[PDB]
Amino acid sequence: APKSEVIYQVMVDRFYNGDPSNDDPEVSKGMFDPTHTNWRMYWGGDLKGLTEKIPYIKGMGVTAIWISPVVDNINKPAVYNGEINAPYHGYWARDFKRVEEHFGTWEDFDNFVKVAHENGIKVILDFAPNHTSPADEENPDFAENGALYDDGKLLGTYSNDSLKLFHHNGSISNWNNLKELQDKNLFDLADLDQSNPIVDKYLKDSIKLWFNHEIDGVRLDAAKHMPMEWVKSFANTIYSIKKDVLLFGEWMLSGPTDPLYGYNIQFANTTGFSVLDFMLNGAIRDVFGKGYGFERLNDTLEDTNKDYENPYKLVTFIDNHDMPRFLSLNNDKDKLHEAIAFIMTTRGIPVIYYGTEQYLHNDTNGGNDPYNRPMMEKFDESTKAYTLIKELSRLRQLTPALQYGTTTARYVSDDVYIYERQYGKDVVLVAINKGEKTTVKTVKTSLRKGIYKDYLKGLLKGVELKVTKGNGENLVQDLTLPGNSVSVWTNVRV
């Protein structure tokens, strides 16, 4: 009876500024905007602040915090056309053995792990071993020239790479060619050569250090840009040091016909990392954000459940830091609530991107990066979305049917989706109406006959269920779903 998880993804610089003294550190000064109007500067969020907000996060039923990368990032900005770009997001590492000084010290990090563990919450580290930082081999004064440091000891720069640390093969151009995706630079990011035994032992020593500070898992950045066999050895290293670790990779897919989807599946089946579920994500945004009909969602769900060997390890999401937030895509809270309810009641592990529960969004430039990383504003624990996210996790803890159960579609139309989750004798039936009020024909269900109250207590306009005994499969009768509603029914005792 495995444990069910719920992930909250935090971008540390944009979550909560707990400590003004690390806003503009001496060693890396000039990259802080206190006004939060230059969207590519550090804004001050830090580990102290994240720690103070763990009760808020725990009040949402979150079981694991995916924290954006907190290794030391470059101490000079990347300047493009006079535009200061700070590594406020954490993906431009200079030193994988040190904590980013804008975010805190080792003591602040250890305190964050301690308080998270005090509240029953796993810490999942976003780790980006594909690369260091932006570099121009012909201009060492640009940014930090992709420098790699080992706990303060310089191992090399891109323009002076004595130890053969990096690939010097230009940038990625043919994005459908695997070898090009692995051996060239992701944009201008100095690409690490994990085949170099120096780099191999460095990256593996680094992740050992972080686990010595009691992290519980890894979200693996840019997983398609590294050789799959090295990523497999990397997971073996982590498994060698800790038994129950949550490992999943960001293997980005462009859409349903992405030519590389087969390597993604292969990655998730063999490396020991599962994947973030981009196929399901696109279907979610299509049907809830673009008005497509539910059969696109159920078809995608059915395909993924066969395509992946272990689909209950998939990590599901509605949005993230690399695409417009759902409300930028479609500013409809009812549709957001329904999407949240969906991933909460679908197989695998759902992610809530920070601030979703506060309807946080900025729609400049379509809501695209950097505008999908706004600063957290209110921490209101009474919003309907906060309440929704808090309640469905309770059911995931009462039954494995949500994360680990089979999936049976009971009714699929353009605007109505009824699906059933089963684990042993546990049954959860869910009905989503993203259209107007309607009354459904006759639905099968394995729920015993009787009347079921909405598990959500009408929070999303949910109704009762009325099951008659069919002999064989039972019969749902006279199900009138209000418009823009979600109902959840179960035989699991509450």
Site of interaction with Ca ion (CB under 5 A): 17, 19, 22-23, 28, 44, 46, 72-73, 75, 130, 182, 191, 225
Rounded to whole angstroms, the Cα distance separating 288 from 434 reads 8
Residue number with CB closer to Ca ion (14 or 219)? 14
Q: Is 381 annotated as a binding residue?
A: no
Residue 471: exposed, middle, or buried by beta-carbon count in 10 A (0-12, 13-18, 19+)?
exposed
183 is in an annotated binding site: no
Check whether 167 is labelled as a binding-site residue.
no
Q: Which is nearer to Ca ion, 202 or 359 (CB)?
A: 202
User: Among residues 137, 216, 250, 319, which one is catalytic?
Assistant: 250
180 is in an annotated binding site: no
- Closest distance to Ca ion from the beta carbon of 75 (Å): 5
Question: Which residue, 73 or 206, has its beta carbon nearer to Ca ion?
Answer: 73
Please, what is the minimum distance in Å from the beta carbon of residue 181 to Ca ion?
8
Q: Consult the annotation and say whether 73 binds a ligand.
A: yes
Tokens of 475: 């019969």
Neighbouring residues of 58: CB distance < 8 A, sequence distance ≥ 6 = 119, 120, 121
State which residue, 192 or 279, has the beta carbon closest to Ca ion. 192
Nearest residue (CB) to Ca ion, 251 versus 342: 251
Report in angstroms how near the CB of residue 330 gets to Ca ion at its nearest. Answer: 33
The backbone torsions φ and ψ at residue 315, rounded to the nearest 5 degrees and listed phi first, read -115, 110
The three-point CA angle 378-122-358 to 5° equals 15
Say whether 250 is catalytic: yes
| SS3 letters across the chain | CCCCCCEEEECHHHCCCCCHHHCCCHHHCCCECCCCCCCCCECCCCHHHHHHCHHHHHCCCCCEEEECCCEEECCCCEEECCEEECCCCCCCEEEEEEECCCCCCHHHHHHHHHHHHHCCCEEEEEECCCEEEECCCCCCCCCCCCCEEECCEEEECCCCCCCCCECCCCECCCCCCHHHHHHCEECCEEEECCCCHHHHHHHHHHHHHHHHCCCCEEEECCHHHCCHHHHHHHHHHHHHHCCCCEEEECCCCCCCCCCCHHHHHHHHHHCCCEEECHHHHHHHHHHHHCCCCHHHHHHHHHHHHHHCCCHHHCEECCCCCCCCCHHHHCCCHHHHHHHHHHHHCCCCEEEEECCHHHCCCCCHHHHCCCCCCCCCCCCCCCCHHHHHHHHHHHHHHHCCHHHHCEEEEEEECCCEEEEEEEECCEEEEEEEECCCCEEEEEEEECCCCEEECCCCCCCCCCCCEEEECCCCCEEEEEEEECCCEEEEEECCCC
Binding site annotation covers 101?
Answer: yes
Tell me whether residue 187 or residue 451 sits nearer to Ca ion (CB atom).
187
Q: Closest separation between CB of residue 335 and Ca ion, Å?
A: 35
Question: Of these residues, 221, 319, 338, 357, which one is catalytic?
Answer: 221
Residue 248, number of CB atoms within 10 A of its CB: 25
Residue found under tokens 């686990």: 211
Is 23 or 110 the residue whose CB approaches Ca ion more closely? 23
How many beta carbons lie within 10 A of that of residue 25, not counting itself? 15
- The answer to whether 17 is a known ligand-binding residue is yes
Is 491 assigned to a binding site? no
Shortest distance, CB of residue 370 to Ca ion, whole angstroms? 18
380 is catalytic: no
State the nearest-atom distance from the C-beta of 349 to Ca ion, in Å: 26
Nearer to Ca ion, 9 or 73 (CB): 73
19 is in an annotated binding site: yes
Provide, rounded to whole angstroms, the least separation between the CB of residue 301 and Ca ion.
Answer: 32
In the complex, least distance from residue 219 CB atom to Ca ion, rounded to whole angstroms: 17
Catalytic residues: 221, 250
Binding-site annotation, residues = 17, 19, 22-23, 44, 46, 72-73, 75, 100-101, 130, 182, 191, 225
Binding-site annotation, residues for Ca(2+) = 17, 19, 22-23, 44, 46, 72-73, 75, 100-101, 130, 182, 191, 225
